[PDB]
Amino acid sequence: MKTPLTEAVALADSQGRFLSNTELQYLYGRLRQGAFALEAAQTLTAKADTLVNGAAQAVYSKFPYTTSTPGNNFAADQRGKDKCARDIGYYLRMVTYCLVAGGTGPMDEYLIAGVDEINRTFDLSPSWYVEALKHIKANHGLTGDAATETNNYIDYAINALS
Amino acid sequence: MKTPLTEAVALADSQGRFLSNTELQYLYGRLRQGAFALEAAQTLTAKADTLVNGAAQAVYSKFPYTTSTPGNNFAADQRGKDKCARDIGYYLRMVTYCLVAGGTGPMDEYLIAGVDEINRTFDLSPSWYVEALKHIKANHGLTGDAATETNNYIDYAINALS
Amino acid sequence: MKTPLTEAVALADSQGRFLSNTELQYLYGRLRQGAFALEAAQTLTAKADTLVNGAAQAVYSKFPYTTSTPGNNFAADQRGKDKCARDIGYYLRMVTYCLVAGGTGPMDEYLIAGVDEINRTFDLSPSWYVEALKHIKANHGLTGDAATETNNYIDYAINALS
Amino acid sequence: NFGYDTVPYQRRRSLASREQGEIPFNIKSPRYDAYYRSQLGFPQVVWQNA
Amino acid sequence: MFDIFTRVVSQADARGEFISSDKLEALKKVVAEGTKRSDAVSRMTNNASSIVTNAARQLFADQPQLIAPGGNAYTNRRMAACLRDMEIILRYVTYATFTGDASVLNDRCLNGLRETYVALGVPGASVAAGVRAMGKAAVAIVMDPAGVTSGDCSSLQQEIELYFETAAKAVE
Amino acid sequence: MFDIFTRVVSQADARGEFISSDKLEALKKVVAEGTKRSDAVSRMTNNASSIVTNAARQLFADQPQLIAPGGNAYTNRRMAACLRDMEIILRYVTYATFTGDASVLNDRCLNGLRETYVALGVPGASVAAGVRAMGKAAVAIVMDPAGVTSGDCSSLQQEIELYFETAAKAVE
Amino acid sequence: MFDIFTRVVSQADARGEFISSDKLEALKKVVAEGTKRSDAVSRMTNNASSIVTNAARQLFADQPQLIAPGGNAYTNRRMAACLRDMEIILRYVTYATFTGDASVLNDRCLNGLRETYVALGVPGASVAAGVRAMGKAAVAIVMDPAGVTSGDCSSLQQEIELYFETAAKAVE
Amino acid sequence: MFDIFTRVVSQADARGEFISSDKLEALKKVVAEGTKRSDAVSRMTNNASSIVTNAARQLFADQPQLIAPGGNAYTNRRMAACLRDMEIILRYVTYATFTGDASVLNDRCLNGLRETYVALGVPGASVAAGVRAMGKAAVAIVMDPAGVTSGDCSSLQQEIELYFETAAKAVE
Amino acid sequence: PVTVAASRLGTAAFDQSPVELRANYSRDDAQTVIRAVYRQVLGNDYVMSSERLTAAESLFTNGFISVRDFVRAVAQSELYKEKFLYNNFQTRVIELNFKHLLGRAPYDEAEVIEHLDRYQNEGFEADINSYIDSAEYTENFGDNIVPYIRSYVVQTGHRTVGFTRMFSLQRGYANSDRAQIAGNASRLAQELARNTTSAVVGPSGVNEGWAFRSAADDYHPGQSLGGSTGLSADDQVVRVEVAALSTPRYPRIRRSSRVFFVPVSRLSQKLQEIQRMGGRVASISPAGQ
Ligand SMILES: CCC1=C(C)/C(=C/C2=NC(=C\c3[nH]c(/C=C4\NC(=O)[C@H](C)[C@H]4CC)c(C)c3CCC(=O)O)/C(CCC(=O)O)=C2C)NC1=O
Ligand SMILES: CCC1=C(C)/C(=C/C2=NC(=C\c3[nH]c(/C=C4\NC(=O)[C@H](C)[C@H]4CC)c(C)c3CCC(=O)O)/C(CCC(=O)O)=C2C)NC1=O
Ligand SMILES: CCC1=C(C)/C(=C/C2=NC(=C\c3[nH]c(/C=C4\NC(=O)[C@H](C)[C@H]4CC)c(C)c3CCC(=O)O)/C(CCC(=O)O)=C2C)NC1=O
Ligand SMILES: CCC1=C(C)/C(=C/C2=NC(=C\c3[nH]c(/C=C4\NC(=O)[C@H](C)[C@H]4CC)c(C)c3CCC(=O)O)/C(CCC(=O)O)=C2C)NC1=O
Ligand SMILES: CCC1=C(C)/C(=C/C2=NC(=C\c3[nH]c(/C=C4\NC(=O)[C@H](C)[C@H]4CC)c(C)c3CCC(=O)O)/C(CCC(=O)O)=C2C)NC1=O
Ligand SMILES: CCC1=C(C)/C(=C/C2=NC(=C\c3[nH]c(/C=C4\NC(=O)[C@H](C)[C@H]4CC)c(C)c3CCC(=O)O)/C(CCC(=O)O)=C2C)NC1=O
Ligand SMILES: CCC1=C(C)/C(=C/C2=NC(=C\c3[nH]c(/C=C4\NC(=O)[C@H](C)[C@H]4CC)c(C)c3CCC(=O)O)/C(CCC(=O)O)=C2C)NC1=O
Ligand SMILES: CCC1=C(C)/C(=C/C2=NC(=C\c3[nH]c(/C=C4\NC(=O)[C@H](C)[C@H]4CC)c(C)c3CCC(=O)O)/C(CCC(=O)O)=C2C)NC1=O
Ligand SMILES: CCC1=C(C)/C(=C/C2=NC(=C\c3[nH]c(/C=C4\NC(=O)[C@H](C)[C@H]4CC)c(C)c3CCC(=O)O)/C(CCC(=O)O)=C2C)NC1=O
Ligand SMILES: CCC1=C(C)/C(=C/C2=NC(=C\c3[nH]c(/C=C4\NC(=O)[C@H](C)[C@H]4CC)c(C)c3CCC(=O)O)/C(CCC(=O)O)=C2C)NC1=O
Ligand SMILES: CCC1=C(C)/C(=C/C2=NC(=C\c3[nH]c(/C=C4\NC(=O)[C@H](C)[C@H]4CC)c(C)c3CCC(=O)O)/C(CCC(=O)O)=C2C)NC1=O
């Protein structure tokens, strides 16, 4: 729940003080981020289906063996392909929430808390979703402050993922 | 909880009135009863062991079969005799409390509420305790208003018992 | 609640021991204090109205500006004079309770806990009540052990007040 | 007879081993009387007799 | 509910033995002074309503914020509610000194007096001061004899004083 | 904890779909008025402590039974406790209007305000009237501009009014 | 915590007036008999542990089901727990008669004695009878003078009797 | 209320799909052993009241403090209340093993058994030991065949054992 | 620091200032702090000498090992596991560790995940270390002071909740923490995840309605839906809770302790009815309107 307004509130709660001017600057920074983050989330939501479709196909061409061998993590038949594409769509939707929230909190709470543990107990590999996010950050094709703020969120997910 | 002071209080509570002169007369009657009831309880407590001992022996001679046949209510062995004598001692102690309280309330609450039900489920007979109380009211040997007030309590226990 | 009997009880509670002879000496000291403290509280209660009246008038002559300027702490009109005299009467009554209790506990609980905080948030000055207590300790005019025990309580209130 | 939580009922309609114990109250008392029937004029007869 | 006779009965039943002789001597003393219980209950029930008005009189001379608008005893309905509260409090005091045991007053007032008074917003301080002044006036009318045959009444004075302090620390 | 952005995120995650465009237009309106959130929070945090003293002023002019001995706000310790309660209540109002969501104030005051106030014996009526007067004074200092560039502020007025009524029906 | 001096202080602060002269005369009587408070507390604290063993003696001669296996006081650990309970009960009686107010015993035993005893399965009847017998033995050792200068002690006898009956109706 | 058929229905409605075939095979096994449910319920309802008296017999041979004056099961009224409690507990056990689901016993005893027993002062230990002994006697009369055609009954033994342990950890 | 009806809430016994271990404490002062540590961490449970752990205690009496590490030592001990980890539920064990070491009631569901998650991931030995190695621990009592209940003071950082949840946690002073009315069950774990608080009750005798406990099946919320639209009375409504109803008997009363919701206009008559049932009132709190 990493939200700079709420993190400022949690800070001033821990201090027990009233609202300081540091928090006013914090609000200014949040507005400065949101003033392009909302439009970036808009075009991401426009592009999202082509993004997850190209990302799934690129990961399938990236490792041929997950299509090849019959296994439980891998997409041998079409149900595994559905679960795989559901997972990358989940990832990109977390990216959009992470962008629109102004912080890593939706990402943190909804993915980062136990991702490596379910990857351990299901024998998944995080590198699949790493190269998926690499294809997404190559595919969104944006420019400006919004593009690199989204790219920052994406490589944060990559770093915490690996 | 049949106490003429408390019954007067419960009455004036139900009416919602202050203390009336009827309650003053009620208090007068309670003092008139207690002025011999306390001395009667004193001599009963003096006589109590001989009373319960003669009452147990008289009930044993009154019905020989409870000594005779082996059963669970009856006193075949000595533990049943102990429980039997405990019961008549309980009875006489309730009589003393009933006397000193000025009403049937200790008797009512502590015996009369479920005596016939435990006599039903244990297959006891109330007539045993009836003839026990008859021996007690024959044995206390008192005279005066206190004697017949105690006798009134005893036959109240007899009537409610049967 | 600084009471030497109760402080002794709290000590023996913390030790978990029975009553020791130290507590017997503590009781002896409390009786020795009370044997004049009660008469001192008596003459203080006799003098109390003249004491608070002279103390209020002396503080008003001590600083003319609280009578002069219209303000919220100050006594511009008569309601502030009433609240001011109520405060010094409160002070002297706490002194009497502090004397009769044998310790600083009534003073501590009823004044000393947050006096400087309400003086801060109301923009009062404690020096007003300091010079008021100085006038009281000059005005009570007693002699003996009781006089200096009361004076000790008064300058305790002065020291904790400033 | 009921208390806080108990729905009311007809207490002791039929005494045990009686063929016809009692008339239930919902029939026995209607919601009109024998008097508002006169205000409405409901006994207009179908003239099945005569 | 619980009388002092029934108090002795409940102690002797919890022990489960017969009653001691000295306790019966104490009960003989009690029935010896039962006429003085009658004297006191009759005396203060004679004057009870005027005692309630005088207690409300001293309370409303003392704290004018209650009569003041926005006060808790301000409205006519709430004023009648105040006099209702004081009247039934004195009524249960008369019940307790008639029975001789404080169990009636405790079990029918201690439970929810504080509860209603914090739940409504009633200042418990005024009821505590009022029941204290009412108890002082009650001792004042009970103790002094007016054409009454003389005797000692210190035990009764202690008893109703204890009853009024239990009421006072009931409401607080 | 919950911000209005995170409110929209939690709705869109409970639905599990992407956020609607019109909701994003509402968020564009929100970030357009974020400077007015800053204006209001700065204005009332500038004057907050004097607002607390003026609220206690009107409360203690209104109900003198609190200052009166035996009252709940009588003692110096309890008086500082009163000012503590009002100060942290206004502090959580400032938290809520800075965040934009009442969840902070609800989840950190609604839970135990009523609970402490019935458990201690605190009259909830005085705190309710005091937070109402404090909210009126807060709207009074927020709305009027003193050398401030002009604009409309009715939505903010509605917001802090709602926050103070949630506080008022929190304590009751 | 609360002493009888502090009791008078708390009454006079709830009223908010100075202390009455007759109450100060009562306190003069109290400090006149403070040496007799010392006499009694010293006497029964001299014999306290033997009083605890004699109380457990009469309890275990009375109710052999406690010593009997399956009984609540059967085990060695629970037996030491029993003697612990009685010792700290007599300790708080000594605290109360040293302070003069029952508030110490009430506020540190009344709260959870009944609670622990119904939660554990402890029969409250045995503790009530035991604290009654312990109180009788305590009055027996306090009242009789052994080489002590003579005086009246009926008020102290009433005081510790009241303290032991508050303990007895605390555990029940 | 809830039967094992209705249990399967509520699972299949929470999933919202048709019932699986293997679950229907389990229900075919259930209706195959319904005559053994009838055998067991008939057997223990034949002997139920004597089982209640024997359970109270072992309880009152075990813990004589209950019969002892001041005990919770001491008085005649409370003794009938005890037998009432045990009889309706065994009645709800018979209800549960007739239905096949513990929901009847849970939803009509689990809620307030512990609650009444801590509120009254009832020692939950004695009821727990008594329902354990009553369950042992119930298995003893159910399992042994007296002129009954032979068969296996281990599943029923497990079922009523589970029902009596749910009762035992209900009262505790 | 309550001081109004402090008798009623039972927190009058916890009035005193905390104990502080000096730089060169004597042997007796050591023993007092050891007795305080035993009483607080085991929740006024008395200790036998066979379970006294005199060996770990002597190391503390030297001064080589701090008080906070002695608190760690008694919580690392097997007796604390046997008294508290073993009989109780593990969520209840987390609840107890909040009282025993931090000194306050938990505030939300996030702390009970963090300690359950930690229990499964690393063990009870690590979980206790996480309680004691906390900023919330080290602020209130760093090394020298015993743990003690801080919930009655706001302490600049209490949520409201812990004040009232603490009275569900601890009763009185005389009550031993192993031994409560509910016994094995955890009071607060129902309260946490619904994010709700029950009404504050004081401990017995001083209050005689202590017996009341909310049923696990029936929540009975405080507000009762609409200032009583459905009860059809113009006045405000208060919650009323009764402790016993024993006069009424078995066929009349299925459960002794229940919650009623009444308008104030009918409050007097229902209170009289409750007293006629011999029922004593636990709590009465304003409900709605
Ligand atoms: C909101 C964030 C979020 C994510 C990302 C998430 C992922 C997630 N993926 C899962 C399984 C799975 N994930 C895969 C995925 C793959 N195998 C492949 O061929 C591909 C390389 C890869 C596609 C990414 C498969 C095949 C399963 C099921 C494992 C199996 O069938 O036993 C599971 C276990 C439950 C299940 O589907 O059956 C979770 C929880 N959950 C979340 O809440
Ligand atoms: C305060 C009033 C009071 C009374 C009177 C009372 C009686 C009482 N008697 C009982 C049993 C009993 N009562 C008897 C008595 C008898 N069999 C005989 O030989 C004699 C004729 C008779 C002596 C009176 C026996 C033998 C039992 C045990 C039944 C059996 O052993 O199964 C029981 C069942 C519990 C038990 O002892 O084992 C109760 C409750 N309880 C009370 O609270
Ligand atoms: C039992 C101990 C005790 C004390 C002493 C006490 C004092 C006390 N004085 C107060 C105010 C005040 N005190 C003053 C006093 C003064 N201004 C002057 O001219 C004089 C120099 C001075 C007289 C001492 C005034 C004027 C106010 C009201 C402040 C204002 O009107 O806004 C207040 C704030 C509430 C109020 O009256 O309106 C408290 C609590 N309370 C206590 O419980
Ligand atoms: C209600 C109609 C009614 C009344 C009034 C009544 C009164 C009454 N009070 C009496 C005695 C007494 N009543 C008192 C009581 C008191 N004397 C005092 O000096 C105190 C002021 C006061 C106690 C508060 C005393 C001292 C005695 C005589 C000796 C004694 O019994 O203590 C007696 C015994 C003989 C007598 O003196 O007449 C009667 C009959 N009986 C009734 O049926
Ligand atoms: C804390 C240090 C600090 C302050 C004060 C700050 C203020 C601030 N308030 C602003 C706008 C504004 N602020 C307001 C707000 C108000 N005007 C009114 O008439 C109402 C009385 C009041 C709302 C309660 C309005 C109406 C605007 C301009 C249009 C708009 O954005 O609504 C702006 C935008 C441009 C400007 O006007 O300067 C700034 C920078 N920024 C800061 O860093
Ligand atoms: C702890 C070490 C210690 C002790 C013992 C102590 C005792 C003590 N008890 C005293 C008086 C007294 N103490 C008593 C008390 C009693 N007499 C009785 O007959 C009753 C049996 C008993 C009350 C339970 C009485 C009656 C007096 C003298 C008159 C009075 O003050 O009441 C006095 C006053 C003068 C004197 O008699 O010596 C002292 C010093 N002081 C101490 O420092
Ligand atoms: C209530 C009046 C009534 C009764 C008694 C009744 C009984 C009954 N029990 C039966 C079977 C049975 N009942 C049992 C049960 C048992 N056998 C054991 O060895 C165990 C001790 C006991 C289980 C506790 C068994 C094992 C069978 C036969 C095979 C089976 O169905 O399991 C059958 C099936 C055919 C038969 O055996 O007669 C009937 C009709 N029906 C009724 O209407
Ligand atoms: C962060 C959220 C939060 C809040 C809001 C909070 C309130 C809170 N208010 C309290 C007391 C108090 N609150 C008042 C309030 C008042 N005085 C009156 O009489 C008026 C009705 C009202 C004036 C505003 C008083 C007097 C006390 C002290 C009560 C006592 O001494 O028992 C207490 C008791 C502890 C103490 O003594 O300081 C708490 C925990 N705690 C929290 O954690
Ligand atoms: C400072 C105030 C205070 C008191 C009074 C107090 C009592 C207290 N008594 C207890 C136990 C006990 N109390 C008894 C009492 C008895 N044995 C019987 O059977 C008789 C009925 C009675 C004999 C006197 C027994 C046996 C235990 C141990 C219960 C158990 O092992 O569960 C316990 C349980 C903890 C332990 O095991 O030691 C506490 C907390 N605690 C306090 O903090
Ligand atoms: C349908 C589900 C249901 C159950 C199970 C139920 C139990 C129930 N058991 C009760 C009492 C009781 N239960 C006992 C139990 C015992 N005696 C002991 O000492 C032993 C520990 C245990 C022996 C078995 C006793 C003595 C009472 C009477 C308590 C009293 O008089 O206050 C009461 C109090 C009302 C009364 O006086 O009859 C209820 C409501 N009520 C229900 O509606
Ligand atoms: C039989 C035992 C019993 C008692 C004692 C009792 C008291 C009781 N007092 C009440 C109200 C009241 N009590 C007062 C009291 C006062 N006015 C003040 O401001 C002063 C502080 C105090 C003056 C004496 C007031 C004003 C109300 C009405 C409160 C309201 O309108 O909400 C109410 C609320 C119901 C009503 O409106 O009448 C109850 C139930 N009920 C009982 O069943």
What is the DSSP annotation of chain I?
A: ---SSHHHHSTTTT-SPPP---TT--HHHHHHHHHHHHHHHTTS----STTS-HHHHHHHHHTSS-HHHHHHHHHHSHHHIIIIITTS-HHHHHHHHIIIII-S---SHHHHHHHHHHHHHH-HHHHHHHHHSSHHHHHH--SSSPP---TTS-TTT--THHHHHHHHH--TTT--TT--SSTTS-SHHHHHHTT--PPP---BTTBS-TT----SS----SS-HHHHTTTT-SS-EEEEEES---SS-TTT-S-S--EEEEESTTHHHHHHHHHHTT--EEEEEEEE-
Tell me which DSSP letter residue G19 carries. Answer: P
* Per-residue burial over H34-69, b = 16 or more CB atoms within 10 Å of its CB, e = otherwise: eeebebbbebbeeebeebbebbbebbbebbbbbbbb
CA angle centred on E76, ends E70 and E82, rounded to 5°: 85
Closest ligand 3 atom, residue F79 Cα: 40
Chains with ≥3 CB–CB distances under 8 Å to I: A, C, D, E, F, G, H
**I260 has which bridge partners?**
I240
In sequence order, what are the residues at sequence separation of 6 or more whose Cβ sits closer than 8 angstroms to the Cβ of residue F113? F170, F171, I160
Among candidates I67, I58, I60, I34, which has minimal Cα distance to I137? I67
Q: How many CB atoms lie within 10 A of CB C162?
A: 10
Distance A110 CA to ligand 1 centre (A): 14
> How far separated are the first and last CA of chain G, in Å rounded?
25
- Which of H58, H79, H84, H85 best tests ligand 10's pocket when mutated (most atoms within 8 Å of CB)? H85
Alpha-carbon distance of A136 to H54, in angstroms, equals 76
> Which chain I positions have a beta carbon within 8 Å of H114's beta carbon?
182
Experimental determination approach used: cryo-EM
Contact of C27 with C19, CB cutoff 8 Å: no
Helix (H) or strand (E) holding E54: helix E48-62
Instruction: Say which amino acid occupies I241.
Output: E
Compare CB distances from I16 to C10, C16, C109 and report the shortest one's residue.
Answer: C10
Residue nearest to atom 24 of ligand 8 (CA): F82
I212: left (phi over 0), alpha (psi -120 to 50) or beta: beta
Q: Phi, psi at residue I287, to the nearest 5°?
A: -100, -60
Q: How far is the CA of H156 from the centre of ligand 7 (A)?
A: 12
Residue A152 burial (C-beta neighbours within 10 Å; 0-12, 13-18, 19+): middle
Answer whether I256 sits within 8 Å of H172, measured CB to CB: no
Give dist(CA I257, CA I280) in Å, integer.
10
Alpha-carbon I68 to chain mean position: 22
Best residue for ligand 9 mutational test, from G51, G57, G62, G82 (most atoms within 8 Å of Cβ):
G82
Q: At what angle do helices B21-62 and B126-139 cross, to 10 degrees?
A: 110
Separation CA F21–CA A45 (nearest Å): 10
CB C112 within 8 A of CB C160: yes
* Helix runs in chain A, H state only: 4-15, 21-62, 65-68, 78-100, 105-107, 115-121, 126-139, 145-161
Q: Does I16 touch chain C (CB under 8 A)?
A: yes
Backbone angles phi, psi at E67, to 5 degrees: -75, -30
Q: Report how far residue C133's alpha carbon sits from residue C8's, in angstroms, rounded to the nearest whole number.
A: 30
Q: Do D3 and I252 touch (CB under 8 A)?
A: yes
Whole-number Å distance between alpha carbons of F150 and E165: 64
Kind of pairing between the strands at I259-263 and I281-288: unpaired
Tell me how far the alpha carbon of residue I161 lies from the centroid of ligand 8, in angstroms: 13
B134: which 2 tokens?
A: 């008859």
Amino acid identity of residue B1, one-letter, is: M
Residue (of B79, G72, B120, G73) closest to H79 by Cα position = B120
Burial state string for D19-39 with b = 16 or more CB within 10 A and e = fewer than 16: eeeeeeeeeeeeeeeeeeeee
CB of residue F38 inside a 6 A radius of ligand 5: yes
> For residue I71, what are its two tokens?
């608190």
Between the alpha carbon of residue G140 and those of residues A5, E12, G112, H170, the distances in Å are 73, 21, 29, 47
> Between the CA atoms of H75, H78, H79 and H85, what dihedral angle is there, to the nearest 10 degrees?
-170
Nearest to H166 by CA among H115, H123, H117, H108: H108
Contact state of G14 with F70 under an 8 Å Cβ cutoff: yes
Is there a contact between I282 and I257 (Cβ–Cβ < 8 Å)?
A: yes
H84 touches chain I (CB under 8 A): yes
Q: Using CA positions, which residue lies closest to atom 1 of ligand 8?
A: I159
Backbone Cα Rg of chain H: 18
Distance set, CA E122 to CA E116, F123, I200, I206, I269 (Å): 8, 8, 19, 21, 19
CB of C10 within 8 Å of a chain I CB? The answer is: yes
Residue nearest to atom 29 of ligand 2 (CA): B73
Resolution of the experimentally solved model in angstroms: 3.5
Distance from CA of I35 to the nearest CA of E (A): 35
User: Which residues, 6 or more positions from B135, have their beta carbon under 8 angstroms from its beta carbon?
Assistant: B54, B55, B58, B59
Residue A29: list chain F partners with CB under 8 A. Answer: none
The bound ligand whose nearest atom lies closest to the alpha carbon of C62 is: 3
Nearest to G65 among H68, H69, H118 (CB): H68
Out of F12, F98, F108, the one facing A5 most closely (by C-beta) is F98
Identify which of E133, E130, E154 has the alpha carbon closest to the alpha carbon of residue E142: E154
How far away, in angstroms, is H19 Cα from ligand 1 center? Answer: 28
Q: How far is I246 from chain H (nearest CA, A)?
A: 8
Q: Position of tokens 């109703």?
A: E160
Q: Which residues contact E151 (CB under 8 A, 6 or more apart)?
A: E36
| Cβ(I131)–Cβ(I125) below 8 Å | no
Residue I149 makes CB contacts below 8 A (sequence gap 6+) with: I11, I14, I99, I103, I104, I166, I170
| Alpha helices (H) along chain C | 4-15, 21-62, 65-68, 78-100, 105-107, 115-121, 126-139, 145-161
CB burial of F20-46 (b: ≥16 within 10 Å; e: otherwise) equals: eeeebeebeebbebbeebbbbbbbbbe
Distance CA H68, CA B45 (A): 20
Q: Tell me the sheet residues that pair with I284.
A: I240
- What distance in Å separates the CA atoms of residue E72 and residue F123, rounded to the nearest whole number? 11
Chain I CB within 8 Å of residue F107 CB? yes
Rounded distance between C-alpha atoms, residue I90 and residue I96, angstroms: 9
CA distance E149 to B21: 20
Closest ligand 11 atom to residue E125 Cα is 21
Could you say which DSSP state residue B32 is in?
H
Q: Which of I7, I15, I154, I164 to mutate to test the pocket of ligand 8 (most atoms within 8 A of CB)?
A: I154
DSSP state of D34: S
- Beta carbons within 10 angstroms of residue F14's beta carbon: 8
Is residue C44 within 8 Å of C92, Cβ to Cβ? Answer: yes
Q: Give, as one character, the DSSP assignment of residue E64.
A: T
d(CA E98, CA E142): 13
Reference E91, options E12, E148, E163, E8; nearest CA is E163
Residue G81 CA, ligand 9 centroid: distance in Å: 5
A122 lines ligand 1 (CB under 6 A): yes
The dihedrals phi and psi of I284, each to the nearest 5 degrees, come to -140, 115
φ, ψ for residue I85 (rounded to 5)? Answer: -70, -30
For residues H52 and H90, the answer to whether their CB atoms sit within 8 Å is: yes
Cβ-based contacts under 8 A for chains B and E = 89
**I270 vs I237: CA distance, rounded Å:** 13
d(CA F135, CA F141): 10
For ligand 6, whether the C-beta of G150 sits within 6 Å is yes
* G/F Cβ contact: 3+ pairs below 8 Å: yes
Write out the binding residues of A for (2R,3E)-phycocyanobilin.
Answer: 84
Quick one: DSSP state of residue C19? -
Q: E65 φ, ψ to 5°?
A: -70, -20
Instruction: Could you list the residues of A known to form a binding site, using ranges.
Output: 84
C2 in helix, strand or coil? coil
Task: Give residue E86's Cα distance to chain centre.
Answer: 10
Q: Are E170 and E109 in contact (CB under 8 A)?
A: yes
Q: Please give the torsion angle defined by the CA atoms of residues D28, D32, D36 and D40, in that order, rounded to the nearest 10 degrees.
A: -120
Strands I259-263 and I237-242, sheet pairing: antiparallel
| Rounded to 5°, angle at Cα B3 from B2 and B6 | 110
- For chains E and D, tell me whether 3 or more CB atom pairs sit within 8 A of each other: no
Neighbours of E140 (CB within 10 A): 13
CB E72 within 8 A of CB E122: yes
Asked whether the beta carbons of H138 and H97 are under 8 A apart, the reply is: no
Instruction: Name the token pair of F28.
Output: 């564009």
Say which residues have a Cβ less than 8 Å from residue G27's Cβ, sequence separation at least 6: C34, C38, C100, G4, G5, G8
Query: Candidates G58, G120, G126, G131: which one to mutate for ligand 9, based on the most atoms within 8 Å of Cβ?
Result: G120
I159 touches chain F (CB under 8 A): yes
- Rg of chain B, C-alpha, whole Å: 18
E154 vs F3: CA distance, rounded Å: 70
Taking only residues 92 to 121 of chain H, the set having a beta carbon closer than 8 angstroms to any beta carbon of chain B reads: none
**Ligand nearest, relative to CA of residue H153:** 7
E149 alpha carbon – ligand 4 mean position (Å): 6
Residue with CA closest to ligand 10 atom 43: I254
Task: Determine contact, residues H161/H139, Cβ cutoff 8 Å.
Answer: yes
Residues 6+ apart with CB under 8 A from I173: G107, G108, G111, G112, I10, I13, I14, I44
Non-local (6+) Cβ contacts of A147 within 8 A are A40, A140
Longest C-alpha distance within chain E, in Å?
61
Q: How far, in Å, is the centroid of ligand 11 from the Cα of B159?
A: 48
Cβ distance A137 to A151 under 8 Å? yes
Enter the tokens of residue I34: 């050891």
Q: Kindly determine whether residue I9 and residue F172, on different chains, have CB atoms separated by under 8 Å.
A: no
Establish whether residue F96 lines the binding site of ligand 5, counting it when its CB lies within 6 angstroms of any ligand atom: no
Q: What residue has token string 């109520």?
A: C86
The whole-angstrom separation of Cα C143 and Cα C33 is 15
CA distance E126 to E64: 11
The rounded distance, in Å, linking the Cα atoms of E158 and E139 is 9
Pairwise CB contact (< 8 Å): B18 & E8: no
Probe site for chain C from F59, F60, F74, F77 (most C CB atoms < 10 A): F77
Distance CA C105, CA C113 (A): 11
Kindly give the number of the ligand 11 atom that is closest to the alpha carbon of E89: 5
**Which residues have a Cβ under 8 Å from the Cβ of G65 and sit 6 or more positions away?**
G71, H63, H64, H65, H68
Tokens of I13: 């016994």
User: Among I22, I59, I25, which residue's Cα sits nearest to residue I145?
Assistant: I22
Residue G109 is labelled as binding a ligand:
no
Binding residue ranges of B: 84
Q: Kindly report the nearest CA distance between residue I108 and chain A, in angstroms.
A: 15
- Smallest Cα–Cα separation from F153: which of F167, F138, F131? F138
DSSP annotation of B111: I
CB F115 within 8 A of CB I163: yes
Spatial contact of I197 and F112, defined as CB atoms under 8 Å apart: yes
Q: List pocket residues of ligand 4, CB cut-off 6 Å.
A: B 21, 24; E 33, 35-36, 38-40, 42, 142-143, 145, 148-151, 153, 156
| Those residues with Cβ within 8 angstroms of residue C84's Cβ, 6 or more apart along the chain or in another chain | C56, C59, C75
Angle separating helix axes B145-161 and B78-100, nearest 10 degrees: 130
Q: Which among B86, I245, G61 is positioned nearest to H69, based on CA atoms?
A: B86
CA dihedral of residues B4, B7, B12, B18 (deg, nearest 10)? 40
Tell how far CA E115 is from the center of its chain.
Answer: 19
